């Protein structure tokens, strides 16, 4: 029941204000004091904790949106799950102290029982559950959009010469990225007619054995389509690793920089000198 729960929250708000007073000392007092002045944080906290049970015992959609807004605000303000968990712990601690002192539970009785005694904690855990549920929505969404952008940015076949298709491949790549690159390169060479694919391995800091093996597989694959693979821009450590892999390197034609490699490619396709 939510009515007398709010009628006791009208003092539990002061209890939680004292709770914030006690808790400010342990976790980044200067940082929180600088980024958020104390009165507005206190009034936001009492607003979050007082109108949750102002509805008739069931739920509230408007306060659900308010709780989601509070979750995103504490995400932006610099309160991760650790800080919110500390807040819940100190909430419980000061509720314990207040009930040891105030001694006024929900139902009218000379000596209440365990029922409301733990209904309080169940409702505390429920509001914490809703808060943590609203906490991670924006984080998951931004992780997903960043992953999608990284996927679409990994293998740009858009840079295109006349009948030649270069490929930047600047960022560091892993196994997932390697599969994405091989797939995208084959798809791009299928859709667009070309004869030379200029792969720029320049840009990747360190390449292990298996990624280099996939790169050689990509070169052999575009050759087996029927387009020469003029891989360009090899760095020292990556060359050491490729040659230590033991894979044959006679079929791959290499060049130090894009200008010279594409000049050699235009030499290969003689009638593309102009």
């Amino acid at each position: 029941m939510y009515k007398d729960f709010a009628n006791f929250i009208r003092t539990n708000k002061k209890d939680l204000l004292n709770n914030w007073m006690n808790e400010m000392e342990k976790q980044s007092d200067p940082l929180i004091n600088d980024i958020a002045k104390e009165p507005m944080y206190e009034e936001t906290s009492i607003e979050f904790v007082d109108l949750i049970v102002s509805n008739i015992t069931e739920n509230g959609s408007k306060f659900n949106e308010k709780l989601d807004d509070f979750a995103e605000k504490v995400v932006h303000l610099g309160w991760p799950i650790h800080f919110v968990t500390t807040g819940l712990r100190v909430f419980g601690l000061l509720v314990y102290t207040a009930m040891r002192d105030e001694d006024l539970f929900l139902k009218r009785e000379e000596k209440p029982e365990d029922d409301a005694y733990y209904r309080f904690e169940t409702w505390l855990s429920s509001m914490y559950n809703k808060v943590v549920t609203a906490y991670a929505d924006t984080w998951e969404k931004t992780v997903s959009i960043q992953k999608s952008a990284l996927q679409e940015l990994s293998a740009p076949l858009l840079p295109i010469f006349e009948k030649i298709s270069v490929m930047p491949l600047i960022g560091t790549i892993d196994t997932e990225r390697a599969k994405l690159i091989i797939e995208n390169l084959l798809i791009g060479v299928v859709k667009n007619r070309s004869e030379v694919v200029l792969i720029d391995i320049t840009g990747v800091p360190v390449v292990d054995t298996m990624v280099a093996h996939h790169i050689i597989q990509a070169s052999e694959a575009v050759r087996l389509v029927g387009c020469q693979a003029m891989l360009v821009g090899i760095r020292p450590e990556i060359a050491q690793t490729i040659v230590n892999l033991g894979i044959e390197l006679d079929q791959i034609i290499t060049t130090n920089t894009m200008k010279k490699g594409m000049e050699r490619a235009l030499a290969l396709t003689n009638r593309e000198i102009v």
């Binding site: 299928v190 004869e195 597989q217 694959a221 087996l224 389509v225 029927g226």
Partner: protein
């Protein structure tokens, strides 16, 4: 039935549309060998456009065909082996598979024509 052997110019053209595993593979092998032995064409051209899925058996049989009719004349696998089947061919049928022309049968015919003219 599924092996349309065509002779045009001083060449030979083939299109593949069966994608079956054993029976079509062996019948295509035998028909291509019999045709190339019957008519003497320096260049034979093979199409793999219709296919998008190949197991080990077909890849080995195709490499075998490459060696087969390379023992009597040059050839081009004109049609770009699709990415999935290309990857499967690399991982299993490890070879250069002759001369290639990458999906443009006009390009393959032109390449074979200029190779035979010289």
């Amino acid at each position: 039935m599924g092996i349309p052997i065509l002779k045009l110019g001083e060449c030979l053209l083939i299109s593949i549309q069966s994608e079956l595993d054993d029976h079509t593979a062996v019948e295509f092998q035998e028909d291509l060998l019999a045709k190339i032995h019957e008519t003497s064409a320096r260049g034979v051209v093979i199409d793999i456009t219709s296919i998008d899925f190949i197991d080990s058996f077909i890849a080995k049989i195709l490499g075998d065909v490459v060696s087969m009719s390379k023992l009597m004349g040059a050839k081009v696998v004109v049609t770009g082996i699709q990415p999935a089947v290309a990857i499967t061919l690399i991982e299993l049928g490890i070879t250069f598979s002759g001369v290639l022309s990458a999906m443009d049968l006009e390009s393959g015919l032109e390449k074979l024509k200029q190779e035979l003219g010289e």
